[PDB]
Amino acid sequence: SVVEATWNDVQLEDSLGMEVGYRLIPMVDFQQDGELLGRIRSIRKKFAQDMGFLPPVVHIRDNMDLQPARYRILMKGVEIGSGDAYPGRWLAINPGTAAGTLPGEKTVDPAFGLDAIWIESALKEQAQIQGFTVVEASTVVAMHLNHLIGQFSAELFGRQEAQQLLDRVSQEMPKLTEDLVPGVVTLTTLHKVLQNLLAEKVPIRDMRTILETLAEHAPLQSDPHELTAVVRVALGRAITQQWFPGNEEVQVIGLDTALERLLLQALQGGGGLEPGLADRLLAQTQEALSRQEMLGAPPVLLVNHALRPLLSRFLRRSLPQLVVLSNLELSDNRHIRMTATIGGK
């Protein structure tokens, strides 16, 4: 080479990163249009004002070993998504209810997994009237990215984001924070609590409700996996209205009155549930999810309060579409109807 090596040649890893084939460099270019840098900003914005924290910056670079119209999406180094995106062309997507077909590459949308076909420019308005939904090239890469952020939002929430959320709270209600951390709760513990909440799709906008439940129940309990289910009920009115809007009936999934005892028998017994039970649940749990799909009902499971911290810990690494709530989290002012059931068949 020409210039001598300095420590500025050390490229620290990126929390979030994109790699780009040379055909896409225009849409990600500082200097030219930047048609996708705009979309990445409005993702990160409509995530802070929505999920309750700022996703880390998306470091975009190119990699000439990538096919020309291809991108990779990266977390802490390791790929977590890739796809094709063709600039001058558009993406006709089918929600299931479009009439006809179109000429072009047949493919599947990288977000929703829907069936979709890349089409050329002048088919736009003609593809829409057949019942399609046509997004720009740049918008597909946006779609794929806003999906993976919501999917990994727990892992993207590092100690550096906890300390940054803790500064943003501690500039609108400083009295809570000034003595809650590092005094009564340690940032390690506050961070693990918010991360547990993000992990189950519960937003952390209500830091009053959180930092108060913690400042109250902390000096007699320090396990974050225990302080979490306490905070969960503080946010019960909000978790309720999340999967069950309006004031109408609550269509939940239920487990058998003895299956409960079956599982509840295996709780206090030790740090382990027994094998054979497993594969039975996951098939039986997926039986209940399907009934709700054809009914038009949410995918929420309502269980005993000591039975939630592990059904969500077990069932969701397999069925992440599942919600696992608690009798003590659901509001009193609602009517419940166990529409589907997890029994012995």
From Swiss-Prot:
Localization per Swiss-Prot or TrEMBL: Cell inner membrane
Domain of life of the source: Bacteria
Signal peptide, first to last residue: none
Record family assignment: Belongs to the FHIPEP (flagella/HR/invasion proteins export pore) family.
Summary of the function given for this chain in its UniProt record: Required for formation of the rod structure of the flagellar apparatus. Together with FliI and FliH, may constitute the export apparatus of flagellin.
Name of the protein in its database record: Flagellar biosynthesis protein FlhA
Included range, full protein: 348 to 692 of 692
